[PDB]
Symmetry: D3
Subunit: 259 residues, 6 copies
């Protein structure tokens, strides 16, 4: 069976795909984090994994097992790391994980990697992981390893799509934690993991121009979300999914032109 | 839907479970590693995750997202880290991962964790992770966190079952990499991920009383397996499954008596 | 002389200010990074140090010696770390530094800290430094240390002020590297360090919804800036300064009410 | 005086041996661990050091100063790290020590190392240290450094010798902590350090198919041993000693053929 | 304006200086430490920074932003890290900082670095940072990076100058913390930051041939100094300044001959 | 047999000694370092181990197995780490080894430790290890752990003894590497390991007031020593031994008064 997930292939099949030249590998990077009263906690892993799978199917790429645990939830982006259920890694651990995988891919013969982040707070640690691995590769004489890092939601740029998605004006990706964007993509991909009836509607989260630590629970909406997902629909999820899959597929074609 | 996987629950459902007292958490610890010409490479994650799921169903416990990447494959227990596809973590990374997760579970209020290893080489790193996290927990005033660590195959002890499993004498867990045990359990759980027709039968791997680094590819059977899986049957897998689930379930009942 | 810089005070003076209760400490966190053809490279340290000094003077707070080196410059926010002159730290070093400072301040008896970031890329590492330090403090029995983190430019929110600052529409803080904002504030504080005649005007930087590593120099404007600073004026700098100093001062009063 | 211990040589003598070509270095790796009421705690260092010395005398190799401290004692292999006297290092420490040593040997010009473990628990950390050092060596252009790692007791494989050693059936290396094997070898090398009269006989240690942490002292024989050493005799020691020295010497001749 | 400080140059100016060949960079390494009742706490940064500036002006070198935070104050050389105000870094942090800077300078194309230490305790950590950096550089194929490390006060060797400076016999650099040497140099450069009238005269600090931890506060003079600076004069400072500036200037000339 | 070495005791004996109250532990910390043409390379371990043994015998203390590998040899104190045979650890490795051993001793119930350094360069890394351990201990609620650190040669202060030792004026401990002091003490303790006939006499090593890296081999005397040991005599060794053993013993009695 032609699976796009490396974990479902034999070693011989993987070896062949890599030896065939220009093989693109994709690593979903997510989190185990609270996502309100209406959705499950593995969202940030599921979403980018699903987007990877589809992109991989379109462009003939392979998908690695996704990073289930990400960096600590930040109040203004994920509610905060004081919530139960959210299980976060330290900076160094995330960074090291990414670094170790890149080194191993290099060992395999891979030279093309797409890292798809699904958890906002991961960014910089993913970036450090990449720099540190590339730095090591140079020590090993390898200079042709290329990585494309992206957060799938950033591919939703078209104002027409945004407008169609947010007929009320777009608030921003910051407060899109457990909101319309994710819940909707979730409704179209894993309906069993989402129950709109538990959505505790509330006004979009607002914060001062600074942060406070220890994180003050009172400053996050009780439900854990940063914006309400009552207007979330599967239809929206379907639109997002296509927009993302297509845009990412094209980006990858641009950065990783077949040889 | 009563899922046993924490990742499929809302934070509120999880919070209630923990607050109810004596909630038991289960963390599958695996690897992405070549498993011969006849099986996929996520075996070491899939097996302990499946066993955890059934045990959790039987005893009312919860399962965490499994660690997909494990410690470097060793020649005498997994064929060696020179094989393509197998993607391994450095020891510090894996240790840090376990340590971060335990720390977070303590923050959640959990005090009962069962770590179920599916990759031989992870053991000592898992142990260090536990030790560092418990050390820290003491600094924090927490002395009631309890961990049970196990490699699921160790519960297949009954000589009658071993005999029935290996009518030819038991060779040992060492060379059980991609052999009868796993392929069998794989046949009863994920048949699509296993194709007995590609099994490259060969004599059980044998090694001198020492190890050589850099790992010498000639000292591992070409297929990557350390023993043949042609005698692997789904029936065998079914017997292993029950023995393991029942034995583990009981063990957890012993160590984690309901309060 | 009543200096607001801890470094210019004697230990007895400092000790007194701390024993006096509710003493607020301020740490500037910047970088040594190229800022185009028209400004010096220590902007990210000077600016937040200047804002801290003035805020401190208004609220009676103390300012620490600023962190001169920051995290690696990123293409989409600082041009990239491939530029000469910019001298960056690894993520663990920056995090370590913040953590070490916080731990020592705690030792001093300080319980109130404001971290003022001047370099966009530092954020997450500062955050990690804070979390790791506070985690340690809890081990030490200290639970009343409070930290306020902020990037001074985030206090320029008022649309009227933004409009006055950017009569042409606001492009965003992303591309504000060596642009109007910084160069203006720079013209009102350190005019010697800025020479508008070298400003290589160019269209605002634009990037695809993803990142590439190794960093592609061609994707950054030649000058190193992400937006032109020709419309930068000292008058604008003066407005920004007051807006920031006032906003931050009031924020600190809210978060750190005198006891 | 032709000592086989590097530490007893001048740097000029060592340099010549290394310069002479194919010089084999041997590093003993042990531990400071409780070994019952009847033996001293440095056993795990002394034993491998003694075997190294005699092997080196036979093949003309050199022996490094042994690593005195090893990884934390584990319940099912060495009684547990709760016992007084046993002084254990963290995993990163032991790994780093092995990594630093190999890096230095490489610097000297050495390209042949035999690591002789005497403490069961050290294995994986020694392995990580070897891996990390070799990786680094590649960065440095050195690909001809070869390492042989072994636990001296694994050289006792001959069923005839095992039978002669354990006329009662062999229990396994697991419970051979402070048992017949070590006590005997200790009676033939350092009798003053062993007093068979304090041997607290008890039935061989048995454990469930899993581990528990924090370590439960009640699960370990009060004496600290995992099997009785009353049947331990000097004669057995002498047989073990020869079997090991000879088998190891031959292995080294196989892996490190004179050039 | 021809500034000698890299932070005050544009990147283009710096790039030109480096591309011109044999450009020498100077990094002041200090601390934020208590310096008695009479001086500010940034002395250790100020002093080496001042020396660097003057040397640089004489030999045409560039000066980096100084390390504001140094290693932990030790009792017998700096009073002890139990004093308020003194804010110290962990060894790993300081070493990492120096390692990172060196790595970056190498990236710039710099191959000549002068490290000027102003805090006694930094030495070995600066040394380890240099060693770790150079080791890495070799991995990267760079073998022509050369570092000169020095404590500016060591250039005050001439017995005549020593005599003239300490007409009473020289006590040693050990107790020269907040004493005559620094206070004088301080009087000739930053008079505002020094007030001789608060100088709490006391006999030179004496200690047994060992150290005690935790640091015992009673064993350190209450003022925080290890020797009195009442005899400190601006005149002395001027002498010291010239002696250091000239001696270091010449040393750099020797070590870094113009190409 | 009343051995003063922990390693030669059973755990029960050790348990008793610790339980009896105020039991002092001593850790020799040395190196494997070239010591010229006339002596062996384990000197820095042997010497402090010997002195510990005798001090322990005199005050009833226990001695831990010594740290066989120390920090990188520095040109101005040990000749440099470019010499073959010398096998050094990274700073972090040394520091962690010290930190782990202290943590374990505290677990044992020990609260009194004497660290005796025999390798000049080890100092600051031993210090960091003590500080880190102590910091941890406080976290664990332990505040009565006390440590005394010393380099045994520092107890040779009496000008009469120095005169008697160096009838030619004392040069300093810096260039006392492989010189009279060590060679002498070596002649009275391990004559077999020293051969005065190979002593390559040379003038005391002299160096500019700065250091250069990479280490320049030409700046260190060819033999590896920093001062000639031709005037080294066993008689001198005996005098040193007593002066050290007595002065240390007294120091321990002062810092660790029997309860
Ligand atoms: Zn999310
Ligand atoms: Zn998230
Ligand atoms: Zn497997
Ligand atoms: Zn495996
Ligand atoms: Zn800037
Ligand atoms: Zn910046
Ligand atoms: Zn043993
Ligand atoms: Zn052992
Ligand atoms: Zn000073
Ligand atoms: Zn100082
Ligand atoms: Zn020495
Ligand atoms: Zn030495």
């Amino acid at each position: 069976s032609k699976s796009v997930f490396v974990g479902e292939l034999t070693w011989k099949e993987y070896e062949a795909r890599v030896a065939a030249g220009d093989c693109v590998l994709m690593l979903p990077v997510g989190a185990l984090e609270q996502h309100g009263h209406h959705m499950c906690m593995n969202v940030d892993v599921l979403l980018p994994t699903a987007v990877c799978q589809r992109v991989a199917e379109r462009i003939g790429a392979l998908v690695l097992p996704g990073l289930q645990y990400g960096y600590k939830s930040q109040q203004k982006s994920g509610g905060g790391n004081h919530f139960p259920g959210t299980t976060s890694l330290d900076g160094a651990t995330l960074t090291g994980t990414v670094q170790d995988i890149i080194r191993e891919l290099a060992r395999h013969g891979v030279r093309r990697l797409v890292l798809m982040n699904g958890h906002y707070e991961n960014s910089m640690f993913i970036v450090e992981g990449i720099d540190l691995a590339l730095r090591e590769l140079r020590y090993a004489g390898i200079h042709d390893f290329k990585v494309v890092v992206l957060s799938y939601w950033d591919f939703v740029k078209d104002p027409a799509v945004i407008q169609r998605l947010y007929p009320e004006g777009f608030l921003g990706w910051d407060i899109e934690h457990g909101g319309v964007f994710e819940t909707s993509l979730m409704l179209a991909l894993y309906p069993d993991l989402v129950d709109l009836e538990r959505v505790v509607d509330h006004p979009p989260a607002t914060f001062p121009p600074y942060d406070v630590f220890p994180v003050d629970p009172a400053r996050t909406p009780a439900p854990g979300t940063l914006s309400s997902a009552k207007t979330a629909s599967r239809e929206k999820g379907e639109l997002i999914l296509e927009v993302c899959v297509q845009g990412i597929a094209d980006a990858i074609g641009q950065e990783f032109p077949p040889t």
